[PDB]
Structures are given as C-alpha cells and as structure tokens.
Amino acid sequence: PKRQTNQLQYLLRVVLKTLWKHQFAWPFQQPVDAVKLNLPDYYKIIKTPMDMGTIKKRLENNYYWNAQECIQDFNTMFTNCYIYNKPGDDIVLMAEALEKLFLQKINELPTE
Amino acid sequence: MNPPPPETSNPNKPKRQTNQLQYLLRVVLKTLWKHQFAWPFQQPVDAVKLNLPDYYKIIKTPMDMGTIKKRLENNYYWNAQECIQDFNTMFTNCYIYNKPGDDIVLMAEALEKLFLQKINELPT
Amino acid sequence: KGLGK
C-alpha cells in the first residue's frame, strides 16, 4: 500500500540534487567500474553495491515506495566505501563529507 | 555621469604589491594547500615515477604549487598578477595533459574553484 | 594519477 511520494520527491529534488552537485560527487555518480579501476576483487568484497547514479534512476522511475529504502541505499553506499577502503583515503574523506551533508538534509525530511 | 577623479595613491608603491603577494601566500595558496586534493600539486609532476614519458614533451611550462610557494617565499615575483598566471598555468597544464573526466582533472577543477573564490577577495 | 583506487 501507499507510495510515500512526498518523502520521495523530497529525496530527489532536495537531497539527491544537493549531493549530486557537490564537488566530491563524481566517484559516486555511477556504479564502481572495477575493470577500469582494476579492483578485481571489488565485487567479491562488496556484496550489495550501491551508488547515486542508481539511486537517482530509481527515484526518477518511481522504483521506490518507502522512503526508508532510498535512505538505506544511501547508507549502503557510504558503508560500501568505508569497508572496501582504508580510513584516511581520499575517497573515504569524500564519502564522509557527503554523508554528513546527507545526514543534515535527511533531518528535514517531510512526514508520512 | 562625471567619472572617477584620477588616481592619487600609487599602486606601484612597495607594500601595495607586497600585501597582494602576502595574500596570495597566506590566504590563497595556503587555502589550496590545506585542501584534501592539494597533494598531487604540491610538487612538480614526476614523469618518471608516474611513468608518463610524453609529459614534458606536451607540457612546455610546468607549474605546481610547491614552486609557486617557493617563488612567493623567495623574491621571484614583481607582482601578484604574475603569480596568478602561474596558478593558471598549473591548472591549464593539468586540463591539457589529462582526459576530461579523469580524477586529477576533477581535483584541479575543485582547486581552481576555491582559487577563484579567494582571488575575488584580494585586497586593493 | 588520481584518487588512488
């Protein structure tokens, strides 16, 4: 039952937009191409791969019904990065700033 | 519609120039320097180490922040505008050599943004 | 050349 559309419109037009356009967005805007980056084992260590490209398409195609799903996809992206990469890595620092911003934005999420 | 009267303070006086060079060192370069992306720009490109044997054939005026820092610290520049040009050369070199979309290009662009934001606040 | 991935 009810598609949580108000919350999901907020996710697309406010939350996604903000992280999408952030200076640190680019490594996260598509799935990790493990070939191009020669991370042979990426897809053996990250079992639930997730990225903003995929989140974006989902929000744009009404893939989601619950807000919590979409929010959890973001959490999975950030965790995927921390588990695969050493703390301190450029990419970990980037993910950290994107996450803090996301947390900030999620705090004003509209209600069901 | 009467225009601004003529100059009565001379921009060539030494402190006016040194104040700008100081801002370029202490505010502008320093800000870029403390950015998470500075590190590939803190020294000349090491063609051998990174194994890019066309770099010095392609890029005719190499530039990096480490060299700019040295010039600012060692009486090289006449004025801020010369220094600004070295920055521009540093960014342009990166955009020329590398493919749009490479990590390094995206990192230079973030630097250039911050650079331009600080340059806008240069004292006059 | 990059973020170091």
Domains and CATH numbers, chain A: 1-109 (1.20.920.10)
Q: With an 8 Å Cβ cutoff, are C3 and A39 in contact?
A: no
Both tokens of A35, joined, read: 């070939």
- H/E stretch holding A57: helix A52-60
In 3D, which of A100, A103, A105, A48 has the Cα closest to residue A77? A48
Q: Which of these, B25, B26, B47, lies nearest to B93 by C-alpha position?
A: B47
Q: Give burial (CB, 10 Å; 0-12/13-18/19+) of A55.
A: buried
Structure tokens at B58: 């392609």
User: What resolution (Å)?
Assistant: 2.3
Contact A27 C4 (CB under 8 A): no
Shortest CA gap A54–chain B (Å): 19
CA A49 to CA A15: how far, in whole Å?
20
Instruction: Calculate the alpha carbon distances from A5 to A12, A45, A66, A68, A111 in Å.
Output: 10, 34, 8, 12, 10
CA atoms of A8 and A65, how far apart (whole Å): 8
How many angstroms away from the CA of B99 is the closest CA of chain A? 14
Chain C from 1 to 5: CB within 8 A of any B CB: 1-3
Determined by: X-ray
Interface test with C, best of A26, A29, A41, A90 (most C CBs within 10 A): A90
HSE-CB at B96 with a 13 A cutoff on CA atoms is 16
